[PDB]
Amino acid sequence: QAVVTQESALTTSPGETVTLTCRSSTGAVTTSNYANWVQEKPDHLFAGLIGGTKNRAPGVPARFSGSLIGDKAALTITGAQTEDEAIYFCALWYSNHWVFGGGTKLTVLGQPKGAPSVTLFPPSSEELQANKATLVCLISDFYPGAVTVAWKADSSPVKAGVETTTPSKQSNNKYAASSYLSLTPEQWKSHRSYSCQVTHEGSTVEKTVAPT
Amino acid sequence: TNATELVQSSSTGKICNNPHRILDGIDCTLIDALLGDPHCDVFQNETWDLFVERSKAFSNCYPYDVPDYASLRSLVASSGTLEFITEGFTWTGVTQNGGSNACKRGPGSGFFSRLNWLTKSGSTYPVLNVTMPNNDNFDKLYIWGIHHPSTDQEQTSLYVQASGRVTVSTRRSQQTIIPNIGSRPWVRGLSSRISIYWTIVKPGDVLVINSNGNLIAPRGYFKMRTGKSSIMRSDAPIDTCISECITPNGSIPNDKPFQNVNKITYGACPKYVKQNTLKLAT
Amino acid sequence: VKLVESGEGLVKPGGSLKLSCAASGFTFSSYDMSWVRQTPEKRLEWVAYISSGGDYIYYADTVKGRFTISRDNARNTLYLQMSSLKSEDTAMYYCTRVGEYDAWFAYWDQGTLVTVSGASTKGPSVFPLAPSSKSTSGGTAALGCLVKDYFPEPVTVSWNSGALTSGVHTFPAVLQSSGLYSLSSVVTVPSSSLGTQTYICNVNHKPSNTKVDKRVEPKSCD
Incomplete structure (x- = not known):
């Protein structure tokens, strides 16, 4: 038994x-x-x-x-x-x-303060030449590890090609998470800008990158 | 002018080997050397003025339990010697001189050098009635134990009877222990333990041992003494110095009236305080 | 004490693999040793045990006759031969410097991950993550590395071969809808030394040995 x-x-x-x-x-x-x-x-x-x-x-x-x-x-x-x-x-x-x-x-x-800092990265020139597009939304240094991820492209909701991990503890007992948006090189260059929306206990943090 | 100091805040980091006799338990403790652990064969019948137990000590033998461990580790320390006299008890129908491959004293089986494992003799285990008087003029220290098997099948396999008992009495004392069989977690690979006990014999007293199973027998006694000896838990090395006061953090001088290193001292050591500097004018 | 384990890779059911933990820091050959695992379900399971080198070795009924534990009192290394592997043997295995005479499960490690799947071990696709140019905060900068489409886990990423240990976070991998992972690491570096220092992304995939260095430069491009 x-x-x-x-x-x-x-x-x-x-x-x-x-x-x-x-x-x-x-x-x-x-x-x-x-x-x-x-x-x-x-x-x-x-x-x-x-x-x-x-x-x-x-x-x-x-x-x-x-x-x-x-x-x-x-x-x-x-x-x-x-x-x-x-x-x-x-x-x-x-x-x-x-x-x-x-x-x-x-x-x-x-753990009084768990406000997240967000970092967003566009696809690389090497990746765009490889017929791939993947934007990275990194959420780190937040507590507790309960967040909701939202991506936006030209003020429209985006829910396709988005996989995101459950937050895990960092070395400093704070949580971190990562969100990835897989696309095609055409969709990336056709829009004005992409935005990753992160909300954690009322405060909303969203960052925007553009292909310039 | 100036101000002389009255507190020893600093240490050496090493132990000065004079003027007292220091005995280092490099890979052994005092109980490992007291029982005769095969990797502790250096300290057999040795003497000391202060024992040093290191954090790097270990035991490569039978897992043993010592009730009143602190009461045994202290009375032997002030004895200052492992002066062991082989006695030669009558173990008739005992199949003595037993051991296991975990207490490896060489290639094959082995056991502790100052105690003896008594198995069964065929398919028979008689009841034990043996005595050994103390006709000399000094106190005797007898070390014995009891075996705790893993199951009733190896209790019946090592000793005919399903349940054991060891009664070691004197003219003023009596000790009776019943073994507690159980498949304990594997320590050094064995699901079995052993509890260690001792009995002190005074001048004019006679030692009596009675048992019907699960007995660990002694091979003699220890000559007890009343010395200024003690035991210290330190990992500080031994240097070729001369210092009266010994400290677990390293020997310190006795010129100042107080010290600030450790409350555990040995020798002509000053008083203990927690203040850092104490200066008086001169 | 310190015990580091190696032997990360991919095996198929019925295969074999050897794991090793190099025990350092304190005296070997004096303590007992064991192997413990943690499944992807985060369930702890006892595997094997050795008694100071031992005549006594015992394994779990799940891993009896398939695994074998060994000890080297000279090299101070403990080995674990995993053989006749199954899918259920997928876990992060830990090497424990524990002695049951005073403590039961005292010392554990950072672990080594071995996966038994039968799938194809694929190689990562590394792409550079370009630093941030404008709308600064008076702060340092953020540049990184993208390790995309690899299987199985894990990958270890260093910066400048151990010269950039301050301000780096390696984020966990995502199990995308392909059976592959994707990892990202980003360092925080001041923009003052951003055109003077060369920052190198060193990814080393132990299961399939892909030791790739990737340079991240401002490309004078948009």
Whole structure:
């Protein structure tokens, strides 16, 4: 069996007490299961925090207390902070295997300013000669990572040839995203200008480039 | 005029090897050397005035658990010696001198040098009733343990009986432990652990050991002493110097009345404070 | 400590591939070692384990008899022979310097990505991204590089072979409707040294070794 289940997403505020669970399918999480707690930071920094269901690493503060609540495990964070916002995994020991949970995405309220700066690039002369056109709209240094992308060509809505990625955390714990507009070299030179519209929590940022 | 200083804020970064005797645990701790870890064979029957445990130490043998680890690491440190006397207990029908390939003392199997693994002798495991008196005029230190298998099938495979027990009593003390079997996570590849215990024997006292399974036997005792010795956790090197005061951040002089490097000291070290400079006029 | 992993490439089901993590920073041969993976679904999975070089090696029931873990106590490198590969073996594999005597899953890495698809490994199409000319902010500038139509991930982009480490952001790739990716990196450079410095786009695709340098110049064109 060996199915580990836990929460998928939680949220808290600095100063509050959090508690993450780790449920087992084959029965109760016993002390013989040696519950583990990892911390997924940006750039894939999976730092191990607690082992043996209570034993804590030497560089982890005392706010992380490992326990066994009810029929499962527990990760109590008494005095949550802004530096505790990450994905936390659980690992239960079964006599032969090492299985993992899905991960509990912990959200923390902080990071005062997340206003995005937008950069737009027209296609390259080498790309236009290669019978291709691709404009790049780069959104970076914003928080939270929930934005809506809109492209405009000559005051008309554009929704064709647009693929855009979900924002991911940067090295500075801010989010970044990229939007690309694939076209043909004829459509690029037939319009007056192209605009990429980015809106994030009321403020709207749109930049315009022209073929001159 | 001027103002003389009364606080030692600076350190050497290295430990001065005089005038005390320093013993370096380069790849070994004090418990690794106390048990006789095959990679700790340098410290057998050695002496010291201050032990140094490094962050680069490791254990290449059976994963061991020491209840009262800090209470054992401190009483042996002030002894200042691993003075081990082989005794020769009566292990009749014991199939002694056992080991595993994880505690590798050479090519094949191996075990710790100061303790002995007692398996079964065919298909029989008798009950243990052995005694070893302390007729000398000094305290004895006996180190023993108990085996925690991975499953009941290897508990019955190593020892005839499904459940063990080890009772080590004296004229004033008694210790009875029941093993807890379980497939623990693989540390150095083994799903099994061992808990380490000890018993101190005084002059006029006699040691008694009783067991019906899962016993790790000693090969003797340790001669305890009352010395000015201690143990320090440092990664500072050893230099060919002479300094009375020792600090985990490096030895410091004793000319000033106070220090500011570390509260953990050894020797004729000054008092501890947190102020940086303290100047008096002269 | 520091452990870097290599072995990025594309394999087809039933194929083979070897991964290696060169462990540096602290003492090797003393700690246990393991391999862990993270699927594109962001699901953690335990793979293999070795005990200081070991008589004891154990793998997961998914990867028993298909993988083999090895250790080199001389080169301070841990290897992982992936063989008889399947589509489900697609993940970013991590090499862990962990010791179960005190910690369970303490050290992890930046990862190495191996994909088992059976599709054709294609080569990127690099195009220069021209800097901004007018309507400045009194600020620096923005020039970059476009790595278009490559598969599979990842590609690593440096600037001036490690001489331009300040003010560069490499953005994640998009899974376009072709089975290919598209990446973009842009640096922030003052316009004062914009006609005096040569800025080079160094893209190195490890799966299919496409080590291309691309120069981005003002072309005296519109």
